[PDB]
Amino acid sequence: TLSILVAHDLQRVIGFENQLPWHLPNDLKHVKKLSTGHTLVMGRKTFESIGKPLPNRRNVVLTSDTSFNVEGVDVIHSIEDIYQLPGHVFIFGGQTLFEEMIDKVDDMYITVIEGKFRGDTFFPPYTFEDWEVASSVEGKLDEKNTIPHTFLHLIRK
């Protein structure tokens, strides 16, 4: 299976100045649950924004840099390389990789953050005419989770 895994706000913002614009531990738990024991594929900039691979899953970084080498990270140099990765593969970020992959993936796990944040990085536009809502689950508002958010699982029609 090839899936997108993303959190975006009401205007599809996913990032600002190398950071997630919001703080939502519940969504990090969601990521951990979905992707543990599987594979994350991310662009070079997304990886460097996090700085270290996420534990207990395969971390794959897409870059043109032939010297790129990080402990606990597997490197690929082409989009075509993604299709050779075994198991459940999650396209993890960023804007560039999402733009290259949105027309290719089987499904998308999207956390819709019900706010409007300042951003410099965006998920590509998409229409529900193309995507069936397999599930839609409201996140719980919390001491440490104070922004409304909805977990969507979308499957290509």
Ligand SMILES: NC(=O)C1=CN([C@H]2O[C@H](COP(=O)(O)OP(=O)(O)OC[C@H]3O[C@@H](n4cnc5c(N)ncnc54)[C@H](OP(=O)(O)O)[C@@H]3O)[C@@H](O)[C@H]2O)C=CC1
């Ligand atoms: N929510 C998120 O996913 C977050 C992501 N970001 C980020 O994304 C922001 C915008 O940059 P964006 O370009 O979207 O980031 P990406 O993570 O998509 O990284 C882009 C880089 O990935 C590599 N890459 C992408 N496609 C190819 C390809 N077809 N062949 C070879 N290499 C490829 C290149 O690396 P190289 O240049 O080394 O060759 C390219 O410059 C950055 O500011 C970064 O912080 C920021 C905050 C949050």
Ligand SMILES: COc1cc([C@H](C)C#Cc2c(C)nc(N)nc2N)ccc1-c1ccccc1
């Ligand atoms: C390791 O967690 C992160 C992941 C990211 C990348 C960009 C991501 C993502 C992502 C999230 C948070 N949610 C969903 N649903 N999909 C994603 N791809 C960025 C910063 C962080 C981060 C780094 C340090 C502290 C807190 C968060």
